[PDB]
Amino acid sequence: MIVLFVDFDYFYAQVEEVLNPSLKGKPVVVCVFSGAVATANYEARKFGVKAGIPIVEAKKILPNAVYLPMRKEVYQQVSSRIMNLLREYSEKIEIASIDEAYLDISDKVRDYREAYNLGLEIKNKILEKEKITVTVGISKNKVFAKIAADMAKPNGIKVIDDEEVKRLIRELDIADVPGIGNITAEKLKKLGINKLVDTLSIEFDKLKGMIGEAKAKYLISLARDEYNEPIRTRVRKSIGRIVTMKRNSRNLEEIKPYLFRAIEESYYKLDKRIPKAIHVVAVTEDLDIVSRGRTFPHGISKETAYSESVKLLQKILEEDERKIRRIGVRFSKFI
């Protein structure tokens, strides 16, 4: 297995320097507003300005900085484009967060050298189309790919071969393990567990009564080099849309525009796929849910969806006396 992990360097602060390019070199800190620090760039992170410290402690440390409010949805749109460009590179992708993604590339590359070169082409593509630099980590599982990027950041790329994994197992501090908090690691330090190998010299049940069962199996499985968590690529089983009407209605020719608008948004919100089932969904005046559907053994063209949704909505009006408040469509069973 070959995992490729992509992490966007100080994402929030980096997006701010893209849209306003005057903040080069100057320390930039994004904050949630009295408040807390959301993200700081490398320039400000070098002086102990981390994420999670209060704003006024950060303005003690460096008053001559640029402080920006949290523009969360600005940063989400850039992230959405970059994730879309990563999906372009391999089908098996897991979006872990707004600035983290895991790619399974076992079928695209044969070794770590080709994986390294593929990560180089990913970094340049992201830099070409969004002017964002990233850190790429490559290893044998998700955890070690993340460890790789933590060691190479910022603007880095690092492979961790299988022999460096066995070295890191004996040498990496427990605190440096992804998915493990700082207080859980402080509890392990106080009991004699400092390195990842130290979990091999303790009984499973004893460690379980210490940090819980989820973390106990997590730590032991990594120390054993038997951590095999797959890339969880999310697939939409159904694609649809529900739209609210201006008034509650039972007139078919008034509901049809809203129902047809839901089709247009839904049919063209799954790239290259055709459905075999259509479901019309009505939310009644009392906010109940009534729905009727049909399955076609062949595909449902968009025009078929037009004439079939009307017959399904007609079937809803005949079998229910309540007025309809919102109307929508759901597509499923893709081929």
Added chain:
Amino acid sequence: MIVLFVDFDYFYAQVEEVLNPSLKGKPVVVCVFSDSGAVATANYEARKFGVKAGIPIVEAKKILPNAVYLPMRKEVYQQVSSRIMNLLREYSEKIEIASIDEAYLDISDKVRDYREAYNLGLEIKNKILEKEKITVTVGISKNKVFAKIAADMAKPNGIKVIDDEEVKRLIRELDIADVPGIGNITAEKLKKLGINKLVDTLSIEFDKLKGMIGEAKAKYLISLARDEYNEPIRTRVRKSIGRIVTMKRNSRNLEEIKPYLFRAIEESYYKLDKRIPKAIHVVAVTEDLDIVSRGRTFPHGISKETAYSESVKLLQKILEEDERKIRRIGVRFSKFI
């Protein structure tokens, strides 16, 4: 099949004299206002002075300008109609509420002949009279159209059976304009082609009639004249019971969605009455107003607490497999016993 049709005589006008008994013999008309509007229903006594239902009000203010005029008390009429329809479901499992004052009942499996249908129809008239002080008209025949025809000839406060033998006679002798679903203009188009009775529709070719009366009524008329018009009584039954609630803010924290989700369970189980579902579905409306849904089926019944615990883990599966923020959350229950 034996259909039993019930029609409330001048309902809006009659229910009003139930609440005010001083209108004995006094002409009363109920009107819908929309400046002014039109007359909704008129009673027996005003109906004899050229004041009928459907025509404006001030048109009535030259023909009967000193009779009682009353505004629309729609909510009272609706509540009276609903009790009567509920009283009717006691008599028949299959019923179709066609409008505020008309309901069809299929009683084929409750009576054996038309004489027993007559006795059942008479006791229905006397139960509606004793519990709501409303007189109704009853029509009994083999389908909806002839059950209504029977009522239209027996009204008001009437009960009439139309034998299988009088159906065939009415096909030959009943005027075309008296057929439900067609009006004067369409009936006039037929009278000048040679079509004056229902039986005359069979005695000339299809597609000439079809290309002059419209197609939908062409097959309707011929269906009746062949006495193979057997459209069943469309009884409405609620497949599923549920509720979807809007949240004040889009979120993805299970602990914050849980209250809204639990509210939708409490409302659903109060609307179930003495019903117990075997299937539960959690429905989530995401921020882009997409629908994500997951369900479970239980061979036995679903408690209210199972629903509490099963909805949480269903919402967990939704949150587990969809990255979008949740805007609305709800439950629905199906597969009743």
